[PDB]
Symmetry: D2
Subunit: 449 residues, 4 copies
């Protein structure tokens, strides 16, 4: 234990900890979840403190020797060497002040090892406030999770779904509407639908990026930029864009909206919620198609990990969590007051978790489920050919009444419509075998080649 | 009190009604909510039936006499002349087939009044299925609601907020963070923030239009187009765009996705929910600013309709409704199976209600609350003159070190920056009283 | 099109409208949804005004002739005679003061026609405020909906599920876990699970009644009872109980909690949301059981209204709406300030609609779906007797290696496990035909009563 | 590291790991959240495995030396000694079978260190299945969180709010409706409302326990009890109640409902969501009451807990109401996830258990922890600005009403007008208009304008 102090007085701190007194106060004040900032959030805070020290150096506001020590410690934090030094709960002051101070105190302690004296709030927090730094880090983490992780993961799932659409282009089967037998489709067509749902999901994430990428940096305490250079924002963003390659990061269109609200996180959660909705439909269909092996639909076989549909269950459970996280994000989003929205840590936890779950589960689903599905091709075609649904094209030749008798007999004898029409002696007067084969071609009915 | 014949018995229908037997069976099957389709949904079904008859006539599949009569009846339906011939509950067969058949039967009856006999299914439902029609009318209605009603209403609200941001550009007041006294801002700056939130809301709606506008029409029963002309979708969409002026209506990118899912309504509801979140923050700040006149902030006076903030209460209640509607839409969205999402009538009721509530309340908020707000300028300035100050704007007069000493002593002795500079005997050749006041001026601190 | 004079100016009021100037201004101020109060809310406002006039008369505060006029007018409103006289939008002032005034004006106008002059405020609103009346009417309406309408409807559905569970006691079929074939159950056992879900739903509704039936009446503007008799609450409640027979109605435990919050509505919506969850599971299984007639499960046939499962679709759509309404109620619930929660009309619309939809859809589901279901008995037994899941009790006789071979051949050749064991020549000293029959007794494996 | 053999080949496992092959496959199959079971779930799985081995011994199905070794290992898990041996993701197979096998394997590995061979499946999973175990452990954990932790934390907040209600019994202030000035109340009355909200919240938790405490144990794979003793459920329950003292644990009313659905978790989340709604109203009113101290309401002062700002050095923030409102938001989100998993079961099994368990147990923990912090570090230390509140109440136009019968509603309205315009008290404005006289004495006025009497405190 070692003694430290802040504006309010003196505080006991673990002796070998890189954090200081404000972080220690926050440890004692918020033992709520036992969970702190994620690696992506810590990395974001590191990048931002580095970019801030760079621009403060560039405007000759910060001595070069201090800027260099900050930039080196900030590199260390962005790299992941210091996660053990961020012990503050997610459920902290709603501005993220506490985690901002955590980053400043940890950076000061790293520089102190290299023999450089930094003041956490006069050097490491120079030209900044808690109010604009913690939301900036949150939007950097979210932008990076959308562009570098989620979109590529959904592109891999899209590609696995589109590959199946192609492989299964002629695998004709019974359509189902309302869960009841309908006119024919192909597994390919169904998988082209699933592929479109994920491609549309990528379009929805891309459409939110012009507002997700907005950074509050330079707005200071209330959005006015008081105590910061007038161009602090555009300079810090230019450093982050050059360092990350994330061209989507940009200065806020309005510095007050960017601090009074987190509407860009609510907007983004909407896209993730819509993806969760798409993945629920895709995973449900796939587990139903794999159902059996005797009493279910037995259309396809899932790869093993009689196989339980374990990846569909993970996907549907992840979707349920994204929906829950979405409601929490919208709740925090609505409840800002005046110059600041004080639900940032909670909203940050939820949107970053939704990004991570959808990313990881989309890759596992694509690789370990979609890629290895095998279709019961001949069985699917036999059912499609034996369905009362395909008798309609026969009504003009044999009449409604006889069409109905053919469907009833085909079902009762478990035979194809073709073999029932022959069995009933309808060939000859009503139509020829050539006519029957044209009318009952289930692949032509599916309007596939 | 006319009696009709159904293939499972007899059906008594009201004599003034234009619907027939299938619609009456649906009236009897689903007495759940006692609410039917809204005007918007009736209109879109009319628009769709007129367009389908036009293309069926153009392809020579439908005798022009019959097409003409369908087109005439459909135009009446689209023009709101029959909003009382659609008695089927919202909570019906999940394809919306019942409401589809309701539209077919009303058109048949209207045509019969002008001497033309139409079969509801073979003529009025020609080239269509029971599964591609109701989702098409739903996306027509939602696209029209977004483009012709919501976006203009939000633009009216944006423009009222932006007008106030300009009026109040130099109306200094105290900032509040965590509800606690903060450095100065202007009422103008806060309104510029509100205006940007509504502008971002319009951008959010605009961004969903490429998917909201996708129509299933031509996909038929399962998305394959069986029993429809190969170009039915593209030709119908072209007629609908021509008649409505809605360039946002488009053929589905994937005919299977367009019927297996309603992801477009889920996406759109997300934009409306975000708008509802923005509107809550704006309405809440405005009622708080008008709070009192004695026990509140008393920053502004709302127009009187001791004024209760009735329009902020209507806005926040609408917002709550849009959040609930949004949960219902997503729930229906997720629960499709194979070739058909069967939550369409419930998802339609919820998205179209969210569009209508946000449109109506945004116009009312803009016109009957925002436009008439008056600022208590002298009160606001007195709050600004009570905000914390910073020593930074003294740096050039006393130096980092003295300024640092001023901040420390102000904090320790719980004094203002201004009084601490005076008490330390800093007034003199280096800093006059005029200079200290100009350096710490509250409007300058707001950096307007 | 008759004319009324208002302080603000003249106001035109429709001819056969019983409302006055304040209601007309509200119609002009809030054109938002075009939907007004529901029949239950209007009846509750009538009930409350009658009981308030009865008590003001009993205490000597109101002339008997004025009290008699109010009680007669209020009875007509509570009888559903004036549902067209409440034109104000749900999205009105959040206390519901506009609707309270609407009731006062309608009563004054009904009394005017009988030669009695009532001041809407001074007489019909005597001892009441603008804030304790509308929530009192909401809680009366909700308590009545729960006790008189929803519980009976749920009891009807319970008894239909229980009746099917009894009729299907020995209808052995293949269990399903993860949608995959599992050891046997009966249709009866599954229906007994659905019955319990609905019985537990009735328990959930009964459990919230102690707080749902709490009435704010007598609290006046802020909960203190200023401007009302000290015993007004207990007196009006005693009249409402004696008149309606709703013993669940009670004074609020705390007069400030009853006006500052609508927590009892949020609690009740949670019970309705749980029922919506139970109904989703029941309706989804039932439509899945009736899927076919060829490519689906084909366990049961639903009665007509190849039959589409239209009532399970109505049920699952109602469940979605109840879930959405539940989210709106909680949102309004959380957002009260100080002495008053100003989301009452929105919360009232959503709770009373959830009660109505569940009541109506439960009765339709019980009568037109559940009562008429018919099981494919012989077919269910044949699949149960043909399932690889049931070979485990052969292990002690022929070994788990030979038992796996029997399972694989039964499935490939679409034969019963019994016929496959015989076909493979396993009958003999290690296994008698009677021993095989005991081992593969699928109904015994289900362990029904 | 150390090699093992599954029936799908060879698996590598951390050396100082007590889990075996199947847990390591699950670690490889499901890298989704990087978050595993919580301490309460692990303890519950320990309690259940020990109760099952006791009953299997009692019924003579499991050799006493095997049962004692499971009981000893299961007690180590329930005591929290092996909280690092459960690496499987929450986002696993929907039954919880992976986490069930994790428990069986860690128990087998603990017993091997003492010279006893346990087959994870045949001995540690005896009479149980892959489907009635995990939901049993979830309901144990959730019942224990409700009765042992949340209800006492709520009672502590209730008691802190009630003590303020009593201390502020006579602290008169203006009421606020629609955020506008209203007739007088006391700060004590408002706090009595907050107290009643938390008390009702405890009633709401109590009312769910008869169904939250229902255990699936003994139902086996599909709810029929096949491969288990007919009375396995009542016997395991009898042991769990005797050992834990948790009287709320009971065998399910219907064995199919208990595995096909998790409606008890949905029901309990509704109670927690209602508490989150109450806490939102209480915390929002409290931060507003403490707002300012110069530009806000300044009704009360919150105890200081850390510095708020560097730019504005002396600024102190309502950090505990902020933590409470954020926890509330998380409970509402978690509640939507639980209901979604709840509705989506199929036939004999609801396969959303691990996700529903994570969300309900977290809601219980956040509400417990934040309720105690709120009671101790915020409510207990609140101070009222008594003179400020009384001044506003004595100057309120709302209090002129009881002058009606003495001077007329018109003259009363002029007193309000004048007092409001000239920033004076109603009592002084009435004197300043020469109203004191024959029909209104100076003590009659003091009696009529008694603002505490107008609050009507019991
Ligand atoms: C999950 O659906 C199934 C699962 C397995 C099997 S199987 O290959 O193992 N199988 C077992 C039954 C059987 C009976 C006679 C001849 C051959 C067979 C072969 C069939 C089915 N469905 C059907 O038998 C469909 C069916 N057809 N025709 C009917 O009249 C009928 C009546 C009621 C329900 C369904 C139907
Ligand atoms: C919805 O599941 C079904 C629907 C209909 C029918 S039916 O009665 O109309 N029918 C069609 C198939 C058939 C084949 C030979 C002899 C008779 C029949 C009769 C069967 C089924 N299920 C099955 O055929 C189940 C099945 N059993 N054995 C297998 O190896 C297998 C392999 C792949 C997929 C499924 C399975
Ligand atoms: Mg004040």
């Amino acid at each position: 234990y070692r003694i430290e102090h802040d504006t309010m007085g003196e505080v006991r701190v673990p002796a070998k900890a890189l954090w200081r007194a404000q972080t220690q106060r926050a440890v004692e004040n918020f033992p709520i979840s036992g969970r702190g900032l994620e690696r992506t959030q810590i990395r974001a805070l590191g990048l931002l403190k580095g970019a801030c020290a760079q621009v403060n150096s560039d405007l000759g506001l910060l001595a070069p020797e201090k800027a260099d020590a900050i930039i080196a410690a900030a590199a260390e934090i962005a790299d992941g060497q210091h996660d053990d030094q961020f012990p503050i709960d997610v459920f902290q002051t709603g501005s993220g002040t506490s985690s901002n101070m955590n980053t400043n105190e940890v950076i000061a302690s790293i520089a102190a090892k290299g023999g450089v004296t930094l003041h956490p709030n006069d050097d490491v927090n120079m030209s900044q406030s808690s109010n604009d730094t913690f939301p900036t880090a949150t939007h950097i983490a979210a932008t990076e999770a959308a562009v570098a992780h989620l979109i590529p993961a959904l592109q891999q799932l899209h590609d696995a779904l589109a590959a199946k659409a192609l492989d299964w282009h002629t695998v004709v089967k019974s359509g189902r509407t309302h869960l009841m037998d309908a006119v024919p489709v192909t597994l390919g067509q169904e998988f082209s639908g699933y592929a479109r749902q994920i491609e549309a999901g990528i379009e929805r994430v891309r459409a939110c990026l012009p507002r997700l990428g907005e950074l509050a940096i330079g707005g200071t305490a209330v959005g006015t930029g008081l105590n910061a250079p007038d161009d602090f924002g555009v300079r810090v963003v230019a450093v982050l864009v050059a360092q990350t390659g994330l061209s989507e990061l940009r200065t806020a269109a309005n510095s007050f909206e960017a601090q009074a609200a987190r509407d860009g996180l609510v907007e983004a959660s909407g896209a993730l919620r819509t993806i969760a909705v798409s993945l629920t439909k895709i995973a449900n269909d796939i587990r139903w198609m794999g159902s059996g092996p005797l009493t279910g639909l037995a259309e396809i076989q899932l790869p093993d990990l009689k196989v339980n549909p374990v990846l569909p269950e993970a996907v549907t459970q992840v979707a349920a969590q994204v929906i829950g996280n979405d409601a929490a994000i919208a709740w925090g989003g609505a409840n800002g007051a005046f110059e600041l929205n004080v639900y940032i840590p909670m909203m940050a936890r939820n949107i970053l978790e939704s990004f991570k779950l959808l990313t990881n589960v989309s890759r596992l689903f694509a690789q370990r489920c979609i890629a290895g599905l095998t279709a019961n091709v001949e069985h699917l075609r036999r059912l499609a050919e034996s369905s009362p649904s395909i008798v309609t094209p026969l009504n003009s030749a044999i009449g409604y009444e006889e069409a109905a008798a053919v469907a009833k007999q085909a079902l009762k004898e478990r035979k194809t419509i073709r073999q029932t029409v022959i069995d009933r002696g309808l060939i000859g007067d009503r139509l020829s075998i050539e006519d029957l084969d044209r009318r009952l071609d289930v692949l032509a009915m599916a309007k596939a080649e």
